[PDB]
Design a protein around this ligand. Sequence first.
Ligand SMILES: [Cl-]
Ligand code: NA
Length: 130
Amino acid sequence: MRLRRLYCRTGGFHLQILPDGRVDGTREDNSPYSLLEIRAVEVGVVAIKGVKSGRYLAMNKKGRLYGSKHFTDECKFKERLLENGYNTYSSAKYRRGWYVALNKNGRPKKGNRTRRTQKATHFLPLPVSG
Ligand SMILES: [Cl-]
Ligand code: NA
């Protein structure tokens, strides 16, 4: 059950870390690039690794999500548990309120267009066959 998928509150998507470095949402169940290793690397901070791509979820200085080729400081996300049961993930490196988020088309949002009150930033990590 150690592997997880990250389900968005909106759109019926779960997060995918694709082998070309892109990040998006998919609504398909048999999506190997959506299988994630979510590990706390500091108190309140996680790394999210796409196990099949080998890439870490990352956010660059422009607020854009990508799948990193190795683990860097751009791969750290502050994880907050909301009272509604979902979690938010915000850039630990760029402390500007920049969240992991998917729009209505399943495409990642630019960090400066996100806020913790947006349902697009709300995700549920769920163990796979847990
Ligand atoms: Cl956007
Ligand atoms: Na899947």
